[PDB]
Amino acid sequence: TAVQDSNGESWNTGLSINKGESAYINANVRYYNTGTAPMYKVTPTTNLVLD
Amino acid sequence: ESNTAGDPYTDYQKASGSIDKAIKLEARDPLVAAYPVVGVGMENLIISTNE
Numbered sequence A: 001t002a003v004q005d006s007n008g009e010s011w012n013t014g015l016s017i018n019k020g021e022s023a024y025i026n027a028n029v030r031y032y033n034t035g036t037a038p039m040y041k042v043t044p045t046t047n048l049v050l051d
Numbered sequence B: 001e002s003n004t005a006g007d008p009y010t011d012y013q014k015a016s017g018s019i020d021k022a023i024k025l026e027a028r029d030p031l032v033a034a035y036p037v038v039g040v041g042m043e044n045l046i047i048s049t050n051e
């Protein structure tokens, strides 16, 4: 006859990532006017170029 | 016909020059149609493999 008493412990850490949407970009910008007239409802279109 | 070339501008509007000033002076002739020809060209292509 035999009796066995076991006690365990575990620790896990994972890390997942998607490779089509790996990060998000946030740009802090500022508009400048160097002409003779004011512009109401300024709506710029910009390019974010990386290499 | 008031628009000989078939564009939005009459014969007088074209010949008299009283149209948009960005139009080429070619199209100031009632026979030459004021007519834009726009095309697109791809320059490079990026692939984002979402695994």
Ligand SMILES: [Ca+2]
Pocket (backbone or CB within 6 Å): B001, B002, B003, B004, B011
């Ligand atoms: Ca005519």
